[PDB]
Design an enzyme around this catalytic site. Structure first.
Site, PDB file in Angstrom:
ATOM      1  N   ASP A  37       0.878  -1.153   0.000  1.00  0.00           N
ATOM      2  CA  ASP A  37       0.000   0.000   0.000  1.00  0.00           C
ATOM      3  C   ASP A  37       0.925   1.214   0.000  1.00  0.00           C
ATOM      4  OD1 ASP A  37      -2.180   1.702   0.052  1.00  0.00           O
ATOM      5  OD2 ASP A  37      -3.263   0.515   1.539  1.00  0.00           O
TER       6      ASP A  37
HETATM    7  O1  LIG Z   1      -4.155   5.503  -4.066  1.00  0.00           O
HETATM    8  C1  LIG Z   1      -3.353   4.358  -3.894  1.00  0.00           C
HETATM    9  C2  LIG Z   1      -3.677   3.703  -2.552  1.00  0.00           C
HETATM   10  O2  LIG Z   1      -3.733   4.675  -1.532  1.00  0.00           O
HETATM   11  C3  LIG Z   1      -3.827   4.112  -0.239  1.00  0.00           C
HETATM   12  O3  LIG Z   1      -3.872   5.152   0.710  1.00  0.00           O
HETATM   13  C4  LIG Z   1      -5.082   3.251  -0.098  1.00  0.00           C
HETATM   14  O4  LIG Z   1      -5.031   2.533   1.120  1.00  0.00           O
HETATM   15  C5  LIG Z   1      -5.210   2.264  -1.253  1.00  0.00           C
HETATM   16  O5  LIG Z   1      -6.474   1.641  -1.200  1.00  0.00           O
HETATM   17  C6  LIG Z   1      -5.020   2.986  -2.582  1.00  0.00           C
HETATM   18  O6  LIG Z   1      -5.053   2.072  -3.656  1.00  0.00           O
END
Ligand SMILES: OC[C@H]1O[C@@H](O)[C@H](O)[C@@H](O)[C@@H]1O
Ligand SMILES: [Br-]
Ligand SMILES: [Br-]
Ligand SMILES: [Br-]
Ligand SMILES: [Br-]
Length: 715
Positions: free
Chosen positions: A241
């Site tokens: 993530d």
């Molecule tokens: O935007 C990219 C990523 O950001 C993160 O803060 C979120 O937890 C993800 O779900 C997301 O895909």
């Protein structure tokens, strides 16, 4: 061979470049992605013919910038119903269609991997991201995720299931230690991902922000290697993530192949540039080239099938109109009818008094990375106008003027991007009496929004109605019932709210969730009966927040949680309420219809390897409609404690006309019957009960079968 070819040509440095993102695109010092707004990009290596691959959100539809600089073209996307609503459809076929639609847009807008679906368990109703997760149940969640992934990947692009694993609260997600027994992990939290991984083979998995039993998920070898690969046979690659973890070399050793978004120093001063850290580790022998090679190979074996690898000329013009239809269908089957005391559907040409500021400030979805930018979003009022329904034009204008007046004031104007919750009781007790005499029915909109980064609170205006909302319902109900007229509430929310206190005051309750761009049209059509509600809850509605078994949420210390223990363990959602006799406001799998269905002709058989359950559903009502049926299995007490019952299969009938029936045939592999005793999956010998329900507490058919021989399965 292609992979081994490229890999053999790569230099040490190029390999390191490949396992780290190029930084968050378009932010800080960073250039925009070639697809403006994309969440991340990989490093290109023209030397050996590797392009940059593009990754983008999200679960409610592709999230990219609608416009670009020095550009006259449009890049609008379709905003679909949120996942909790998609889950309410209980319709695999439909989920696959939603995936295809999104997948086509992903492909044609130059994206290689869609950052979806999200499939964390609804452990607690307060989690800020519940709206973009499916269910409290691993089977519903896994099955819906699987269908979605298949749809997406039939379009030549990749999906990414997230967030692995146990990312069940937003509070301190990047830091909190999540304490869970291996049993709860295997039966509840890993289980949905296991189903998705094995049935739909997603290109990628995203490791979660949180620590799991002491180790960051992105740095967790047990999770990413032992379970994901060695046990489950995952063949794709794992990405982190965004900015998750604290050690790039630990991430690679754990099996987290792709570190995203890259350039962590841009967000956290104490982080080094990951390329520099990895290069140093390789030089000092903290990391072997062979580990690096495997990570690179995991990424390439997947991405050589990406459109960008074959220089695919994307059109930038997906069939939005065709996709809007799919979006409508999804929302139509995802609305849940919770209450109907001879209130719906509305009589033709009925004069509607529309209440609630949400009729105009309709919530189409939650905020965060899972947001969307549709060309339009049809509000509930606009939808009723469009369908030419008879409403109080006077009242609507009053609402329009009130909102604009309020959004102008200092106290209620949007700041930084939040909109202060507007007061709902601005009508006089006598003013509403007027409405009751003028109109035939009242329809009240209750709106809630939530999003990534914040958890909800068990207070008025959030989980509980605000006093102004309660006063509005009380007054509207009294005045209209006074005239012998019916009152309907529309729940425009993203997760459960308190209902017990006010539900007996109204005649109809439609759970409209947050239905994306088409919301208003879906709502109007449900109201008229053009759509017959076929949705059912994928999550339990508790009578009160204090009844919720995940009481430790959000951890300790409360104001700044460093850890949270899942004390309730496997007894989460309906598993708790059934097992310990706590009554929900509305149970898992609950949903009403404008028609009735009769269940019959149960046949249960088990050949030692497959449980076969057959039954018939007939439409015994006067309107066409679909029925969701759920198969719960109650295992014998035997050796180990187990929940009262567990969902093992489910089905949704075709659109049945009055008098029509359909024969349902569901097969359940013996393995799915197992419980995990801490060491092994075990299917205990003894008598099992098959419970076929219209909800978890409305069992229509019961039968038994027997397992003669205990079966054991080592992970
Ligand atoms: O935007 C990219 C990523 O950001 C993160 O803060 C979120 O937890 C993800 O779900 C997301 O895909
Ligand atoms: Br989870
Ligand atoms: Br009710
Ligand atoms: Br919400
Ligand atoms: Br705790």
């Amino acid at each position: 061979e292609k992979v081994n070819e490229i890999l053999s040509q790569l230099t040490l440095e190029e390999k390191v470049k490949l396992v780290v993102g190029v930084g968050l695109p378009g932010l800080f010092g960073n250039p925009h992605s070639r697809v403006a707004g994309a969440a991340g990009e990989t490093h290109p290596v023209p030397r050996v013919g590797l392009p940059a691959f593009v990754l983008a959100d999200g679960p409610a539809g592709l999230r990219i910038n609608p416009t670009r600089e020095n550009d006259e073209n449009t890049y609008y996307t379709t905003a679909f119903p949120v996942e909790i609503m998609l889950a309410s459809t209980w319709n695999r076929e439909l989920l696959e269609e939603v995936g295809k639609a999104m997948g086509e847009e992903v492909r044609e807008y130059g994206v290689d991997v869609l950052l979806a679906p999200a499939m964390n368990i609804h452990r607690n109703p307060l989690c800020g991201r519940n709206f973009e997760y499916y269910s409290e149940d691993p089977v519903l969640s896994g099955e819906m995720a699987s269908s979605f992934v298949k749809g997406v990947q039939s379009q030549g692009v990749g999906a990414c299931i997230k967030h692995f694993v146990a990312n069940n609260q937003e509070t301190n997600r990047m830091v909190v230690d999540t304490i869970v027994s291996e049993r709860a992990l295997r039966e509840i939290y890993l289980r949905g991902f296991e189903i998705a991984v094995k049935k739909s083979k997603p290109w990628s998995v995203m490791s979660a922000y949180n620590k799991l039993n002491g180790k960051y998920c992105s740095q967790n070898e047990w999770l990413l290697k032992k379970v994901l690969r060695e046990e489950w046979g995952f063949e794709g690659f794992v990405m982190s993530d965004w900015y998750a973890g604290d050690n790039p070399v630990e991430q690679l050793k754990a099996g987290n192949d792709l570190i995203m978004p890259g350039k962590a120093y841009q967000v956290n001063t104490e982080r080094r540039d990951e390329i520099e850290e990895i290069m140093e580790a390789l030089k000092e022998g903290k990391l072997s080239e062979e580990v690096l090679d495997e990570c690179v190979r995991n990424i390439l074996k997947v991405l050589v099938n990406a459109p960008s690898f074959k220089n695919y000329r994307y059109s930038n013009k997906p069939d939005l109109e065709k996709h809007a239809k799919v979006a409508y269908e999804a929302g139509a089957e995802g609305v849940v009818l919770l209450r109907n005391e001879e209130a719906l559907p509305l009589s033709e040409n009925s004069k509607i008094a529309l209440f609630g500021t949400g009729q105009i400030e309709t919530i189409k979805g939650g905020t965060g990375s899972g947001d969307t930018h549709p060309r339009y979003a049809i509000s509930i009022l606009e939808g009723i106008k469009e369908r030419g329904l008879n409403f109080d034009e006077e009242l609507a204008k009053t609402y329009e003027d009130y909102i604009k007046k309020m959004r102008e004031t200092e106290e209620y104007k949007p700041r930084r991007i939040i909109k202060p919750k507007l007061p709902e009781n601005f009508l006089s007790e006598k003013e509403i009496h007027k409405l009751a005499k003028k109109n035939d029915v009242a329809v009240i909109v209750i709106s809630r929004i939530s999003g990534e980064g914040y958890d909800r609170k068990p207070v008025k205006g959030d989980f509980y109605l605000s006093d102004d909302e309660t006063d509005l319902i009380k007054t509207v109900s009294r005045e209209f019932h006074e005239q012998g007229k019916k009152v309907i509430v529309l729940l425009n929310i993203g997760s459960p709210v308190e209902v017990v206190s006010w539900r007996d005051l109204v005649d109809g309750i439609l759970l409209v969730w947050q239905a994306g761009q088409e919301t208003g049209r879906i709502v109007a059509d449900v109201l008229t009966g053009r759509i017959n509600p076929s949705g059912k809850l994928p999550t339990t509605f508790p009578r009160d927040y204090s009844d919720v078994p995940s009481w430790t949420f959000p951890g300790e210390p409360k104001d700044n949680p460093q850890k949270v223990v899942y004390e309730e363990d496997i007894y989460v959602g309906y598993r708790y309420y059934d097992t310990f006799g706590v009554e929900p406001a509305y149970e898992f799998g609950y949903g009403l219809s404008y028609t009735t269905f009769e269940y019959s002709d149960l046949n249960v058989s088990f050949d030692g390897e497959t449980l076969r359950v057959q039954y018939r559903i007939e439409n015994t009502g006067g309107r066409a409609g679909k029925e969701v049926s759920q198969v719960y299995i109650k295992a014998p007490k035997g050796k180990i404690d187990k929940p009262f019952q567990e969902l093992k299969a489910f089905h949704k009938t075709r659109l049945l006309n009055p008098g029509e029936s359909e024969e349902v045939v569901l097969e359940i592999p013996v393995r799915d019957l197992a419980s995990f005793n801490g060491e092994e999956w075990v299917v205990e010998a003894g008598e099992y009960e098959v419970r076929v329900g219209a909800s978890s507490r409305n069992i229509k058919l019961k039968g038994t079968f027997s397992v003669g021989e205990e079966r054991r399965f080592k992970p």
